[PDB]
Subunit: 229 residues, 4 copies
């Protein structure tokens, strides 16, 4: 129909999508003043009020551009995100956790969707991830096998650090980033277990070698693309 075209040249319009970018920037400043108990005690009304207006508008416009583009709307990753942070946001307060009240702030990520220069650079960042998969595979297997070892070795005398398989995972991740791996983790262990450095000096070495190579992978792959294009 032609009323269809009337609605498409509204919704595909520059001004329509530019308007909801201003609605994004407005609701980001509001989002930020909500973290002020002073502001909320004066303008807590006008503010949360403004937060409900922007959410109906995004649902009015997610129903509108779900109509303009019908099923094609759903094979698009960026539209799915706008649908799934509008709806994560669409849940009302005092229902569920507060964790949903805070995840409503995820709707600021609609700025990355509605802005072109931003969906470009995010396309770059995710374009990189297919290549990293084999090393992130190898990498995980390593953290798994070494978390099992570390729990079996240390989980009984250092339970806050190696009790769970998970507690072990976390500490190891922490050690990988060299966050206090020595004065804080390994040195305290050599007070009970003297040859513990045999477990962590190998460990530090291997995940640092693999991080270097993961990054050289990003660097050469990109260079190869540039060279071939």
């Amino acid at each position: 129909g032609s009323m269809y075209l009337r609605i498409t040249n509204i919704v595909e319009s520059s001004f329509f999508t530019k308007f909801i970018i201003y609605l994004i920037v407005l609701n980001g400043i509001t989002m930020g003043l909500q973290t002020s108990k002073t502001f909320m005690q004066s303008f807590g009304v006008y503010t949360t009020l403004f937060n409900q207006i922007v959410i109906t508008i995004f649902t009015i416009e997610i129903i509108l551009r779900i109509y303009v583009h019908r099923i094609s709307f759903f094979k698009d990753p960026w539209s799915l995100f706008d649908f799934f942070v509008v709806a994560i946001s669409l849940v009302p307060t005092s229902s569920g956790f507060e964790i949903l009240r805070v995840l409503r702030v995820l709707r600021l990520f609609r700025l990355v969707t509605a802005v072109p220069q931003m969906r470009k650079i995010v396309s770059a960042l995710i374009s990189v991830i297919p290549g990293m998969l084999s090393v992130i595979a190898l990498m995980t297997l390593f953290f798994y096998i070494f978390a099992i070892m570390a729990t079996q070795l240390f989980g009984e005398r250092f339970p806050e650090w190696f009790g769970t398989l998970g507690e072990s995972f976390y500490t190891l991740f922490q050690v990988m980033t060299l966050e206090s791996w020595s004065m804080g983790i390994v040195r305290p262990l050599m007070e009970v277990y003297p040859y513990a450095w045999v477990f962590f000096i190998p460990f530090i070495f291997v995940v640092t070698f693999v991080m270097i190579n993961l990054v050289v992978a990003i660097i050469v792959d990109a260079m190869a693309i540039l060279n071939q294009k």
Copy 2:
């Protein structure tokens, strides 16, 4: 006029600008001995005295080379800097803060202006910054959205770290550099909030992925320029 040319071939002279480089190096050694309470108690007079002589000379010469080059002086970034650290310096003591007394030391950055090899390498460093803008954009939006979350989640029971939106920003920046993110920030939070690692392990991951890519961006862009030039 020809008295104009007399003043231009003075001010565009090698010796003129080389002389104010020695005045820079002299006033840097003086600048440094001023931080010695011993030195200041003997030669505090001769010293601050020397600091007032170099500042009139730079204003004599900023009035001179503002005359030689008239308006063109102002469309030049390096001359604006010399004008704005001479004048930040031109404010007298006991007026305002001490923060202006110390910012007078910024006039040592005139060494980067008056030396060619130095304005070259600074040109390299700033030439890099136009490219970084889209990722620094994305990056900020992320720190904002996640500071709001983190205040809403933790600002009441950990007020020194998540009370303000700003307190949150700082801690997050701190966590990004892996400065005691674990034994110091996240582990203390898991004493009250057990599933806090769900907020920071994602967070550490995303800003490390984006830092890697920002740096691979610098590396490939530069490589591309070299290849095409």
Copy 3:
């Protein structure tokens, strides 16, 4: 013989090796639930039972594919690994240390052997190591010479950090990763030994210069290979 070919087209089969990949994934989930004292108190029987079944199967199949390929089996690094983590695993409990009971978990690294995409990426990582050898040589010599110095200088008044040649090695390695090198190591030393920063500021500088170059070595070597291939 043709019974030989009957056994080879069994053992070189897709399904045979795919089956022992499922046996790997099964014995990894089991491996992981063993670290649960709750799980072990109910299903400790069924579980360790399952661990003995998978080890006979791997020895049945290491005797099988040592037959199919006879001596060639042994000039292959990945088969040697499967032979040496099956046999490290083949030792029975209550004989030796517990350190062998835990190293049995190394048999999960059979997933990297039995999966193609995984032996590829490990081939990449080890392919990189021949080049790094001269800098790892230089590097070690440096840690040695500087551990000897550091013990001679500090081992008597700081025995937990510089008593052994080994204690010195460890601390230095720790300092190299910038793990609390300052508030934790060097600042406490400047309470007794004031000009200690002369030993560690040079040291931090040299191993950071050499790490940068080691990584630029990986990056240019790989780039050169890409360019020439």
Copy 4:
């Protein structure tokens, strides 16, 4: 003369220089067992005895190869080093400091001189340094100007960290490596000086931008050489 050629084909011989490599490796193992108070109490005699034999041999051979090559010996950086760690070593004990007794261990760096594969990789590492000079220049000027500021701002209430111009330099260097810059340096300062992060968040930013670029400089320069050669 021909006795000259007799001495040159001795000193330029493979076996001559290979022999003093074994003397290097021997005196490195000895060097290392000297840090053992147990070893020194049994074999302290045989050991230090061995240390005096190797030093006469190196002076016999530094007088020999100073004769074979006369003045050309001195325009060679690697021979100057062998002359200046033999002579730093030639000073006798109980004269001067112990700091000279320990610097005798520097003579192990003769292994890098006497081995070809080693003087190669050190040639690589130093070949890189001419390029880094302009950024290390800019870099220093920055640490200087900002150490002066930081002493003027904080040296009176935090004297162990900002009292000297030097104390300031050290702390800043420490902050640059992100070693406890937050929970340890800047957070304690915001207890007295609340807007201190304005001094260090800019500071952390600028030296991290410049480190990234210094390393991209190494990476592209090397790539350019590879491409043009």
